[model samples]
Target: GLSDGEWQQVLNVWGKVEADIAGHGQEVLIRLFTGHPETLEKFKKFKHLKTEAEMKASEKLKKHGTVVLTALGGILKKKGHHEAKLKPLAQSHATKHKIPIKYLEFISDAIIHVLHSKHPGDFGADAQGAMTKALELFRNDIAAKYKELGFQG
Candidate 1:
């Protein structure tokens, strides 16, 4: 897991990204995860595990992996709702591709961070345009990442 200080750094980066592109059309949020190399290696090996028996055997150590997203706006607002809306999309995408929930969660968190940057607190027309641009950039980045992972939209 990320230490408190590292998490703070993650949030700080997220806040700056949101503030900097608030006026650009974009959606942004911060994605936080423990940068444990062992955890990643284990995840990459998931497909090699034998039956459900073998998979369950590794559950103890694998449980340490975690993924979370920090949402900026209040839950009732449009941006807030946007984060919630991603859940079903994530679930469906994960199911379609047979990817693990952990990977799906990571992707969703990344999307939230991108949206959060674009939609920082409510603003007027000019700011909205800027936010929109930010969202567009985030969307492109997400697409690219998904492509790299061999995910279909």
Candidate 2:
């Protein structure tokens, strides 16, 4: 969905924030949980931290957010080709966490919201569109896994 130049632009911006992986990840999770409170409870873990202060400040926020988003970044960076990489993660979420598919979708939107706030003028329409496509691609991959496992949500 993105041109080569747009893809590179997305990667470049994403790479810059990857340097602050922990901080950036926390922001995304915080946005998701705070914006859509139900998401905090969708995961098997991290639910107990429903309170705004606890969820935002938890070490799990920093750790899971970084690791999960970083793993997802691999697929977003490549867009289409690395979709298979999402399967294992989807499996883990389904089996271990019974995570809702909506929650997976929420992260993509939430992350970009964080990006917009963090990058300000840097995240223009082109960047937003590319990232949205990339996130949608990743979501489709995960959705396939969920479907294969008979997950409705």
Winning candidate number (lDDT): 2
TM-score of 2: 0.88
Pairs of residues at least 3 apart in sequence or in different chains that clash in candidate 2:
none
Among all windows of ten consecutive residues in candidate 1, which has the lowest summed lDDT?
Answer: 24-33
lDDT of 2: 0.79
Alpha-carbon TM-score of each model against the true structure: 0.27, 0.88
- What lDDT is reached at residue 39 by model 2? 80
- lDDT string for model 2 (130-150, tens) is 788777777777778888987
lDDT of each: 0.37, 0.79
**Over the stretch 38-77, how does candidate 1's per-residue lDDT look in tens digits?**
2233344354544434543554323322122222221112
Off by over 4 Å in 2: none
Cα lDDT, model 1, residue 68: 22
lDDT of 1 at 138: 34
Q: Residue 107 lDDT in model 1?
A: 42
